[PDB]
Copies of this chain bind each other. A is one copy, B any other.
Amino acid sequence: DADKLPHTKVTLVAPPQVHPHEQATKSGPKVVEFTMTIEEKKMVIDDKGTTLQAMTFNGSMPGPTLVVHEGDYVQLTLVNPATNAMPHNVDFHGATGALGGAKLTNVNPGEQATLRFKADRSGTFVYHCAPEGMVPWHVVSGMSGTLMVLPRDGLKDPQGKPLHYDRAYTIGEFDLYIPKGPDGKYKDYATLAESYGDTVQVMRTLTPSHIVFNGKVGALTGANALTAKVGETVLLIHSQANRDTRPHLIGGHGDWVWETGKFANPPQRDLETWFIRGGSAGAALYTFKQPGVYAYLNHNLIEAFELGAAGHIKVEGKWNDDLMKQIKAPAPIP
């Protein structure tokens, strides 16, 4: 009985970090409590001042990543403050019933609600807002994130050998549909509601104006780069709640990848580029062997370099000439 099980209260952290957690654990099922507060706000999404009338869980795109173990129960309190304009809810792809919880979490501004569900399937799963009649708008405006349900004994390779990571990063990729006026410039809206009609028209073209990691062009580049060192194993969680993407680590690989994101299935190894289906989260493990600045991107290179779907990983350590060596540097042709 879930009512009898012990409870824990997890504190969420902002992407791209993931709140501390055990991988393999000796604990039995618990009811893990989370709270998220919805924030509608106007956000600058590129380096030329373009704005999005955005909607978020906890003020971030993506929302924070929630981590539990298979057999736990997720107990979320969802808060929609009176300062917001729209109704909201939450659909957990990791949950069973009632449209993922959406039917049980409809909160108008000034309201909150608490949902419990059993996390009985391991994997990374999208959660997103889904208010009746407004679903794609709320999703593309920023209302999604990841629930990671780890196996109780941690991640395993296809032969059952234990796989372990030193840190986890969470990347949410957002296809944005920002309207333009007759002058060809992006529109700037005074309120969230005023953006709706024009945005739906752009959405229907199926052509994003921007595709961004974690809420903005360059959100994870230069100074905001993810970090690691040679010998470190990272888990890269990638969510896309609305549209396909194809992650790639430039100069690296997916050592073990669950592209459909479900840990009871064997991962694939040595991937150059993997595939996250729109409406899902997937995960890749990589152990760094070389130092330097890597790019992590959507390998539609137009989507990456022109539209914004690219970040960096800065990696410290010693160079390995066995793996790669410049034999002859750029020089005149003889």
Contact = CB atoms under 8 A, between A and B. Distances in A.
B331 A112 contact: yes
A306 B204 CA distance: 7
A328 B279 contact: no
Contact of A299 (B271, B278, B332): B278
26 contacts: A2-B322, A2-B325, A75-B327, A96-B252, A96-B290, A96-B324, A98-B251, A111-B331, A112-B328, A112-B330, A114-B326, A115-B327, A118-B324, A135-B305, A136-B302, A136-B305, A203-B302, A203-B306, A206-B208, A207-B207, A242-B302, A262-B271, A265-B269, A272-B280, A274-B277, A279-B301
A268 interface: yes
A153 interface: no
B98 A292 contact: yes
Contact of A272 (B243, B272, B279): B279
Interface in A257-286: 259-262, 264-265, 268-275, 277-281
Interface in A309-334: 319-320, 322-333
- Give the contact-size bracket for chain A: 35 or more
Interface string A50-90: 00000000000000000000000001010111100000000
A106 interface: yes
A272 B323 contact: no
Interface in A139-188: 139-140
Given A280-B273, A292-B97, A323-B120, A112 B333 contact: yes
Nearest to A112: B333
Contact of A290 (B98, B110, B251): B98
A264 B269 contact: yes
Given A97-B319, A203-B302, A324-B104, A260 B253 contact: no
Count of this chain's copies in the oligomeric assembly:
3
Contacts of A264: 269-270
A302 to B, nearest CB: 5
Nearest to A95: B324
A253 B121 contact: yes
Interface stretch (A122-130, A189-197, A213-221): A122-130
B243 A126 contact: no
A330 B114 CA distance: 8
A225 interface: no
B301 A242 contact: yes
A260 B270 CA distance: 9
Most buried by B among A140, A259, A330: A330
A104 B96 CA distance: 48
Given A97-B323, A98-B292, A270-B121, A204 B307 contact: yes
A273 B269 contact: no
Contact of A122 (B101, B270, B303): B270
A116 B271 contact: no
